[PDB]
Design a protein around this nucleic acid. Structure first.
Ligand SMILES: [Mg+2]
Ligand SMILES: [Mg+2]
Lengths: 251, 50, 50, 1340, 277
DNA sequence: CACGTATGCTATAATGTGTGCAGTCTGACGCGG
DNA sequence: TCCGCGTCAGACTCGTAGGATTATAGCATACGTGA
RNA sequence: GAGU
């Protein structure tokens, strides 16, 4: 693919495929030309070296290197290990309708609540706001709905307020060691850019506000909303699954 | 160490007591950064088998 | 042991996704193994219902 | 005291007299690079060394050769300023004189054939700034010094490698600076082996055979002799008494006529001294004792001439008989012991498959080049080219030096190539260590860890460049004609320039300078790294190296290192520490002679230090006599105990020298746990400079040193009176005594104004002098961004109360008063840089026009005719900055766009829409715009207006230079003319243009007029060529990247005020996030009515054990108490006398105050200016370990009429009732860290998606989705939440059908799940089939 | 045992005998005349020359083994076109073919995007010019400085230096941390995301719904022209194929459908609102 | 035909690689002699 | 059956910055598509 | 480099 600056960028497989094709076609040539056998042999060794490099580079001997010194990433490498397909892109994913920010105390909150920044929530619930805007007839079309939310019009905040009521959001803290590392709350919109966390669940998250950050996820489907409210809600998940003990305790 | 720290934090440590404190402290901190990975690998193996 | 027990599951998608992936897929490819997808790992990978 | 100190004196509670002042803090960087460019004549250094090393080089034919004469650095085309604005490297051209000499092949060495000498350009080398940085591509970058294993020799041993045997195997390693590694090692069977570059293992004796050592000679080298005389019939043996030690006597030991030991009897000390004193030389022995002794030399039968026994062969009764009967009656055995003198080499010769020298060279050759057929030529060549060739092997001076001292030699300096002596000596010492005499070294010892500053590394890359060019040169010299070929036609600059740019650019050690703070800069430049090339890896690093080493004392900080995976490896240098000439770390120490402590100082290296006993600095001196107490606390051999006074050899110079610069700035560090202190010194570096530079009330004293030495403050080169103050510049007129007789003697410092930092913070210099003020040399003329009157000001002190409050300070959470926000004191300035690129594309050039399809006139209002936003214009997300678009081709317009454009009429234009607009949610004021145009593209009308600005501004700048310089210069001639013919007002009447014609008598003063006349004309022409240069650079169509026609850079400024989610901290490693900004009415307030600024949670103290923060608070309050009392006396206007009395009594409070400060010397006016500054609060210094004691702080509180407890009665702002008990209240100096919530908050519903995996991108800069990782997945699995999980795998991520369908369902209210298959799995399959494994889906 | 492909090949060539002038001529006479043995002996004997030359053309594009095969192909052409009757030696002649064949192959394979020999050779003369200029101008040479020296167009020089921009690998990580590379930031531009896809669905469904509210004849003359409801996007004159069969009446009714629809967008709340879009 | 792209030919004699780095990581578990 | 060499693993999210280099002669006749 |  072409970069903006007129440059190109390509996969290592293309360099490896080029190696294999050049040596293979040269072998076709040497066979049409009836070449002496020592030369035939060297080309067959070269072909095996290039195929081996293409399938699994650093396996048989020295991996074939780029100008950077670094060995070219082969097919096997794209399945293999942490950077491979399984671990990186398939058992764990980048996810839509996800945010993160600093957390801070919300001592006024009840156990089922969390302070959710207005700007953050406006963007996370974008399609829900557009759909409600068309039902009120405030927005003629989606482009008009988009421009209304960009302008952050006064009526849009009242709609946003309408949508987030009774809608659970997931808060997550790294690292996620046990299931309580994710809990659902009912969000409370706040002006200001930090998430407000309930004190008593600080224990489950191992969250202390020395600058900790947390991640926000919106359950979209009716199924997901009910999964969040019934299974994952903080009010519903008090006891440690490890020992029969209440994990929610004043500190 | 054969010679302990006779002083306390309100009293204030001297250069040698503080230098001696350092070793233990930094061993602790280095353990946090480095060992969390062996423990986590064990979590991973366990999860995978169950 | 945990590691070998996870690799002993009939599901080769689960086995390969854990570790040792080069060896797992050669063993499965030569046996002509068919994974009927009962496990959680396997369903998460194909993006289906747990 | 100095003039700037007369304005504000810091009260010092230190008690130890300072024998050594803090050195220049940026020593390392500047000395090192100075040595790299320093052209040394003999003792090659840096470039000079690089040329002498590679050159002179000759052709492969040997007839033609290139020799080096001399080099020069051209002066830099663009200065630091222009380089920073343009985005180019600040460098000098390298011009090298080189002489092509040619030999005749007919004459022997016909050197007088062709000699062609000329000066060739090869590359520009980056220059170091005044403050130890490089400007690369317009960005300040620092190359951090490195810490690596010193070349030389090293003896090591895995303590129980095989855990089964658990036997200690000793090894040696010879580490060169350049060449192959040479390893010697033991095996379990005690056989000595040799390996080169950890290759396949070889018997150690094989290498000796390569050096031409016969078996006989090898045994003669490592073993002693045991002599056997065969006399008459009985066997006799030559004795050394102290051989038969710790042994059992196997036979009856008797000599002349006295029986000493019986069979099976232990030979102790007593028997040995008895035998020695009796003078026993020969003893009769049994014939059967020889069975098992190893013969040393060969013996042949003189009669037959055949071998009776070869060397190293175990003797028997029959061999001995045959030896006697041939006529050998003096058998030489090898004295080999199993407890002391181990027979290692003896057993290794039996393992050695090789016989002679050639057999050994072949076997070595066969190791490193296995399979390839050996030749003798090849074997000899390879072995000589390993460790015996000038070219491929060099220990360096350091290597030979460390090598010789490790082998207990006398000679320091010598050959970089290994001699036969060297190898054998190393084997010998390894064997001594196996025997039990000698010890193995350790790598963590700073005697084995060397520091490599920039200049040596630049030198190394520069050598590589020269070596690569040398290949090209030899190859072109071979095929070249001798006559036509110029020397510069063979040299290429690209390879050298490429090696050096690759160092200052690709290298791990060359990184973006950390400059969000003066302290951050100065600490970053004094950083040491064990990483990068020739170093350890984060992955490769154990725990031993990381941990604090006894040798670190006074050299490296124990308390300064990142709490990352880089925890052991990155380290700040200690305060007084310095680089040894050879590169080892050294620390100053005060020499103690006869118990009397001299003021002579000695820097001791790591190795030297171990040998003496050093007293601690805390020892009480008897006023220049000796130690008061008869026991003194000292340390030697890296361990600490009591000693007598006369035993003490040295003493610590300063209390401070154990700690680094960063840590030295923590007051009451003595009362803080090392963990918290680490975090404290690390976070102090992240303190963002506020709008108002506020001095810290509770300091240490290092503040002044850091601020001045960092270079961010303008300091006076020469003392005198200030002629002209301005916001933009400062002119000082120099005093007659310092003022040179040549020039006018007026220094002009132009101050650097609101400019961008690397962290997007704001760098501004403010003038801190008044117009017409007398100034001392080396005083602060202007303050840098985080400095107040020459002291370091990283944040702001304020009124703090430690008490819980309604959970708004729960876990470190901080409750701050709106008052602080209102006073705008924590407010910060941020400068961002946006650029707009007009490129040349396939379709055509992009235009920077204001004429853009589909733009409101509201938007076009802020753009000028050219399409560039006006200076001063406020902008917010989506507003257009620079009107730039990219050309577009043909595009199937959808039927709806056909219809829509038919309604409106406005058809699409050629260029599309790619104008640079304000990033979403960032909002600021345009403070400046820069335009780069290439050479020959038609300029914007705006670019022309900007050139008019720069030209006329340049003209004004240079005009004011020549005007102030001419006024100052004639003002001197006027004074010279008065010395001789004084006619003051009479000379000034007729014009000043007709002045230099007037002379004086033929004296030194007539020659002074001539000097001033020559320089006046010098400046006259200099002004012309300077202005021509300025005008050329302003006209200069900047050379940009290929494809790019012009680039417009907008600089936005933003004023950010503190708010919840911002990160704040003290200097004791106490972090916190602001939770709430409280109204002033609600803040806890005292009986006097004054409200607190901050309420911190006391529950963050006892666990943390950072009690520094509490002492800082108590003393801070006391300081502010004195401040409030002076403030009260100034409001009343009592008088000079009374203020003077109180202030003297205050400065001279402490039990043993070091600093005495008499106010009787201060004039009345000087007193008033001091009190004026001290009213905000009296600045106090607590040196690190030599700080203020509780008694002193309580005494200071009593002078303030504040309580001994430092706890006060506080009242709830809301209720008005008092809190139940006294609360600790005072002033803690607090910092706003770079972690602003504005930079951290991020949110996304739907956006761009990744290229192959189709899942969303990462990161807020790419508008990224949060990673829901394996650990996060498992949580949903535990919960049983199946749809939430599926959702995150499919419609949220890859499933392309699913995401759009789901979006449409969400806008239609119906939250229906419509999933499919993630696109990454489809890819997986394709990747596995590309491997040639059939993976198919069997359907239902 | 040696399993290095290189060392094994070099061993093989080592043990074939070096030729004298008269041997070369005798073999080569029969070789041109077609002697299977003769060509083989000349080739196998002169392999060592190939390796000596391929060693001088190293560290550039391909590896040593790669160079050696193309070099061999050059030596083959030399043996095919050698003139024994000319007094000139074989080694001199072969040198040309091996250097030639190696250089030409290093120009087509060295670059991921294949540059034709013409572009490459042009570029090379610009480059060697630049080297001479840099050696007297201390500072590197500008595009115009090179163009000034050749008396040639600045665009010619700049276009050629543009082609010299070398590829970056997608998989090469950024920031010393082997974490995220170009692939991990480089977004799919061709395939746009669901906000834009769903906007187009809403736009297309809006106009389809507007035809239902417009005149039946106006909706059967406007939609089928643009290809909104029809199958093929016709023009003013082409709407005569359907039922219209008119030129004036089609043009009036197309625009009459547009005028009533423009007032439908002014009233719903777009018109100049959706003008910026 | 032309514009771009390719294939071709050179005649003193030349005839066995290296080359630039790697820095040593570690505890475990199989797999040929 | 035991030494030795090989291969395989080694927490989770967040940030920052963009990217480097070399060099391939010179000229004469073909090969392919649009006009 | 930020919280573990
Ligand atoms: Mg905490
Ligand atoms: Mg925390």
């Amino acid at each position: 693919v072409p970069l903006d600056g007129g440059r190109f960028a390509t996969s290592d497989l293309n360099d490896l495929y080029r190696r294999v094709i050049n040596r293979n076609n040269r072998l076709k040539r040497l066979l049409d030309l009836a070449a002496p056998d020592i030369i035939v042999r060297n080309e067959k060794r070269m072909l095996q070296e290039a195929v081996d490099a293409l399938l699994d580079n650093g396996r048989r001997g020295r991996a074939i290197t780029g100008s950077n010194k670094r060995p070219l990433k082969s097919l096997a490498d794209m399945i293999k290990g942490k950077q491979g397909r399984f671990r990186q892109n398939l058992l764990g994913k980048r996810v839509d309708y996800s945010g993160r920010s600093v957390i801070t105390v919300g001592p006024y909150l009840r156990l089922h609540q969390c302070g959710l920044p207005k700007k953050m929530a406006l963007e996370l619930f974008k399609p829900f706001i557009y759909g409600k805007l068309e039902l009120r007839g405030l927005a003629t079309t989606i482009k008009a709905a988009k421009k209304m939310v960009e302008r952050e019009e006064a009526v849009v905040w009242d709609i946003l307020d309408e949508v987030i009521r009774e809608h659970p959001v997931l808060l997550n803290r790294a690292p996620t060691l046990h299931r309580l590392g994710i809990q659902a709350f009912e969000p409370v919109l706040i002006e200001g850019k930090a998430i407000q966390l309930h004190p008593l669940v600080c224990a489950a998250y191992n969250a202390d506000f020395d600058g900790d950050q947390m991640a926000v996820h919106v359950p979209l489907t009716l199924e997901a909303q009910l999964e969040a409210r019934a299974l994952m809600m903080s009010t519903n998940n008090i006891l440690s699954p490890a020992n029969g003990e209440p994990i929610i305790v004043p500190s | 160490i054969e010679t302990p720290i006779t002083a306390n934090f309100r009293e204030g440590l001297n250069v040698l007591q503080y230098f001696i404190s350092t070793h233990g402290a930094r061993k602790g901190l280095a353990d946090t950064a480095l060992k969390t990975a062996n423990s986590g690998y064990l979590t991973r193996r366990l999860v995978d088998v169950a | 042991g945990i590691t070998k027990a996870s690799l002993a599951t009939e599901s080769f998608i689960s086995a390969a996704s854990f570790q040792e992936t080069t060896r797992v897929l050669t063993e499965a490819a030569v046996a002509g193994k068919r994974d009927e997808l009962r496990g959680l790992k396997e369903n998460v990978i194909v993006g289906r219902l747990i | 005291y100095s003039y700037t100190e007369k304005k504000r004196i810091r009260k010092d509670f230190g008690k130890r007299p300072q024998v050594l002042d803090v050195p220049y803090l940026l020593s390392i960087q500047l000395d090192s690079f100075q040595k790299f460019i320093e052209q040394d004549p003999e003792g090659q250094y840096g470039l000079e060394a690089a040329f002498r090393s590679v050159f002179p080089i000759q052709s492969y034919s040997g007839n033609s050769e290139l020799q080096y004469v001399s080099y020069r650095l051209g002066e830099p085309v663009f200065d630091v300023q222009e380089c920073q604005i343009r985005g180019v490297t600040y460098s000098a051209p390298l011009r090298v004189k080189l002489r092509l000499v040619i030999y005749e092949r007919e004459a022997p060495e016909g050197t007088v054939k062709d000699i062609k000498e000329q000066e060739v350009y090869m590359g520009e080398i980056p220059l170091m700034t005044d403050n130890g940085t490089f400007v690369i591509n317009g960005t300040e970058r620092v190359i951090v010094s490195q810490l690596h294993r010193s070349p030389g020799v090293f003896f090591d041993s895995d303590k129980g490698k095989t855990h089964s045997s658990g036997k200690v195997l000793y090894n040696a390693r010879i580490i060169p600076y350049r060449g192959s590694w040479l390893d010697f090692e033991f095996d379990p069977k005690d056989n000595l082996f040799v390996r080169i570059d950890r290759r396949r293992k070889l018997p150690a004796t094989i290498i000796l055979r390569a050096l031409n050592y016969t078996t006989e000679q090898i045994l003669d080298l490592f073993f002693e002799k045991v002599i056997f005389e065969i006399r008459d019939n009985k066997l006799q043996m030559e004795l050394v008494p102290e051989r038969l030690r710790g042994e059992t006597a196997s036979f009856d030991i008797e000599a002349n006529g006295k029986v000493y030991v019986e069979k099976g009897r232990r030979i102790t000390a007593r028997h040995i001294r008895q035998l020695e004193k009796d003078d026993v030389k020969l003893i009769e022995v049994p014939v059967e004792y020889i069975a098992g002794k190893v013969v040393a030399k060969d013996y042949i039968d003189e009669s037959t001439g055949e071998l009776i026994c070869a060397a190293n062969m175990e003797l028997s009764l029959d061999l001995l008989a045959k030896l006697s009967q041939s006529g050998h009656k003096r058998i030489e055995t090898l004295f080999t012991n199993d407890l002391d003198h181990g027979p290692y080499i003896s057993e290794t010769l039996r393992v050695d498959p090789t016989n002679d020298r050639l057999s050994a060279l072949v076997e070595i050759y066969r190791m490193m080049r296995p399979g390839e057929p050996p030749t003798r030529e090849a074997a000899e060549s390879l072995f000589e080219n390993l460790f015996f060739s000038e070219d491929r092997y060099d220990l360096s001076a350091v290597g030979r030096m460390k090598f010789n001292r490790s082998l207990l030699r006398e000679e320091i300096e010598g050959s970089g190539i290994l001699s036969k002596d060297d190898i054998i000596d190393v084997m010998k010492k390894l064997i001594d260590i196996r025997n039990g005499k000698g010890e193995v070294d350790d790598i963590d010892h700073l005697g084995n860890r060397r520091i490599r500053s920039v200049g040596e590394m630049a030198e190394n890359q520069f050598r590589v460049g020269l070596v690569r060019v040398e290949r090209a040169v030899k190859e072109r010299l071979s095929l070249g004609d001798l006559d036509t070929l110029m020397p510069q036609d063979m040299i290429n600059a690209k390879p050298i320039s490429a090696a050096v740019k690759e160092f200052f650019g690709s290298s791990q050690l060359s990184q973006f300078m950390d400059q969000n703070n003066p302290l951050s800069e100065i600490t970053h430049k004094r950083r040491i790294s064990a990483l990068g090339p020739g170093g350890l890896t984060r992955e490769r690093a154990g725990f031993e190296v990381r941990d604090v080493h006894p040798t670190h004392y006074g050299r490296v900080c124990p308390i300064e290192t990142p709490e990352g995976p880089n925890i052991g490896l990155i380290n700040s240098l200690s305060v007084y520490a310095q680089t040894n000439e050879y590169g080892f770390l050294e620390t100053p120490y005060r020499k103690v002679t006869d118990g009397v402590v001299t003021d002579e100082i000695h820097y001791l290296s790591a190795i030297e230090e171990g040998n003496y006993v050093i007293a601690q600095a805390n020892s009480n001196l008897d006023e220049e006599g000796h130690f008061v107490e008869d026991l003194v606390t000292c340390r030697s051999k890296g361990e600490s105990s009591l000693f007598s006074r006369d035993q003490v050899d040295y003493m610590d110079v300063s209390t401070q020298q154990v700690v680094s610069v960063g840590a030295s700035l923590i007051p009451f560090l003595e009362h803080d746990d090392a963990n918290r202190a680490l975090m404290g010194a690390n976070m102090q570096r992240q303190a963002v400079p506020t709008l108002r530079a506020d001095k810290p009330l509770v300091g240490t004293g290092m503040e002044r040193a850091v601020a001045v030495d960092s270079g961010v403050t303008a300091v006076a080169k020469r003392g005198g009176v200030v002629q002209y103050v301005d916001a933009s510049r400062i002119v000082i007129k120099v005093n007659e005594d310092e003022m040179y007789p040549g020039e006018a003697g007026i220094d002009i410092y132009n101050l650097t104004k609101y400019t961008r930092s690397n962290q997007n913070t704001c760098i501004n210099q403010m003038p801190c002098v008044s117009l017409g003020e007398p100034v001392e040399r080396g005083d602060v003329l202007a303050d840098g961004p985080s400095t107040d009157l020459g002291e370091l000001a990283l944040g702001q002190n304020m009124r703090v109360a430690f008490m819980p409050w309604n959970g708004y300070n729960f876990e470190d959470s901080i409750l701050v008063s709106e008052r602080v926000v209102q006073e705008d004191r924590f407010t910060t300035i941020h400068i961002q840089e946006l650029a707009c690129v007009s490129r040349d594309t396939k379709l055509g050039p992009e235009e920077i026009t204001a004429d853009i399809p589909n733009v409101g006139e509201a938007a076009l209002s802020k753009l000028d005719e050219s399409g560039i936003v006006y200076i001063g214009a406020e902008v917010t997300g989506g507003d257009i900055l620079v009107g730039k678009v990219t050309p577009k081709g043909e595009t199937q317009l959808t039927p709806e766009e056909k219809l829509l454009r038919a309604i409106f009429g406005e058809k699409a234009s050629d260029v599309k829409d790619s104008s640079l607009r304000v990033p979403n949610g960032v909002s600021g004021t345009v403070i400046d715009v820069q335009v780069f145009t290439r050479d020959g593209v038609e300029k914007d009308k705006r670019a022309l207006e900007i050139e008019e600005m720069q030209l006329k501004q340049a003209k004004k700048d240079l005009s004011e230079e020549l005007q102030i310089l001419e006024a100052g210069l004639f003002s001197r001639i006027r004074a010279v003319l008065v010395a001789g013919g004084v006619e003051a007002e009479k000379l000034d009447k007729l014009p000043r243009d007709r002045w230099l014609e007037l002379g004086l008598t033929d004296e030194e003063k007539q020659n002074q007029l001539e000097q001033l006349a020559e320089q006046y004309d010098e400046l006259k022409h200099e002004f012309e060529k300077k202005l021509e240069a300025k005008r050329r650079k302003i006209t200069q169509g900047d050379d940009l990247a290929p494809g790019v026609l012009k680039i417009v850079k907008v600089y936005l400024a933003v004023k950010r005020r503190i708010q919840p989610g911002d990160k704040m901290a003290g200097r004791h490693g106490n972090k916190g996030v602001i939770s709430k900004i409280n109204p002033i009415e609600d803040m806890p307030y005292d009986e006097n009515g004054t409200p607190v600024d901050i309420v911190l949670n006391p529950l963050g103290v006892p666990s943390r054990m950072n009690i520094g923060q509490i002492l800082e608070t108590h003393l801070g309050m006391a300081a502010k108490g004195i401040g409030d009392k002076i403030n009260a006396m100034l409001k009343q206007q009592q008088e000079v006398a009374k203020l003077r009395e109180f202030i003297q009594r205050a400065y001279d409070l402490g039990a043993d105050v070091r600093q005495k400060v008499d106010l009787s010397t201060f004039s009345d006016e000087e007193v008033m200016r001091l009190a004026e500054n001290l009213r905000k609060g009296m600045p106090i210094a607590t040196p690190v370990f030599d700080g203020a004691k509780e008694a002193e702080i309580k005494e200071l509180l009593k002078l303030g009429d504040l309580p001994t407890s430092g706890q006060i009665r506080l009242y709830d702002g809301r209720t008005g009732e008092q809190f139940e008990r006294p609360v600790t209240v005072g002033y803690m100096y607090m910092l706003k860290l770079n972690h602003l919530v504005d930079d951290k908050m991020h949110a996304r519903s739907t956006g761009s998606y990744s290229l192959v995996t189709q899942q969303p991108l990462g990161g807020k800069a790419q508008f990224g989705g949060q990673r829901f990782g394996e650990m996060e997945v498992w949580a949903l699995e535990a919960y049983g939440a199946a749809y939430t999980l599926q959702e995150m795998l499919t419609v949220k991520s890859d499933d392309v059908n699913g995401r759009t369908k789901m979006y449409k369902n969400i806008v239609d209210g119906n939250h229906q799940m419509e999933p499919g298959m993630p696109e990454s799995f489809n890819v997986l399959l394709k990747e596995i089939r590309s491997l040639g494994i059939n993976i198919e889906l069997e359907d239902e | 045992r040696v399993l290095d492909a290189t060392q094994l090949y070099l061993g093989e060539i080592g043990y074939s005998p070096l030729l004298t002038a008269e041997e070369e001529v005798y073999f080569a006479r029969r070789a041109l005349r077609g002697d299977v043995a003769s060509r083989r002996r000349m080739i196998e004997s002169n392999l060592r020359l190939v390796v000596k030359i391929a060693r001088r053309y190293g560290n550039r594009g391909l590896a040593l083994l790669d160079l050696i095969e193309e070099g061999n192909l050059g030596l083959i052409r030399a043996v095919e076109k050698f003139d024994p009757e000319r007094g000139f030696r074989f080694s001199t002649y072969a040198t040309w073919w091996i250097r030639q064949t190696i250089e030409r192959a290093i120009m087509n394979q060295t670059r991921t995007i294949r540059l034709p020999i013409h572009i490459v050779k042009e570029l090379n003369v610009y480059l060697r010019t630049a080297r001479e200029l840099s050696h007297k101008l201390d500072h590197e040479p500008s595009a115009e400085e090179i163009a000034e020296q050749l008396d040639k167009p600045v665009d010619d020089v700049s276009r050629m230096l543009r082609l010299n921009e070398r590829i970056t690998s997608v998989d090469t990580p950024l920031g010393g941390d082997s974490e995220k590379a170009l692939l991990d930031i480089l977004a799919d531009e061709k395939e746009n995301g669901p906000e834009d896809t769903t906007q187009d669905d809403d736009m297309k469904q809006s106009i389809v719904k507007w035809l239902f509210e417009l005149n039946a004849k106006q909706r059967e003359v406007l939609a089928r022209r643009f290809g909104l409801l029809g199958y093929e996007a016709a023009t003013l004159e082409d709407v005569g194929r359907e039922i219209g069969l008119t030129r004036e009446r089609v043009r009036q009714i197309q625009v009459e459908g547009l005028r009533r629809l423009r007032e439908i967008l002014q009233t719903q709340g777009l018109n100049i609102e959706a003008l910026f879009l």
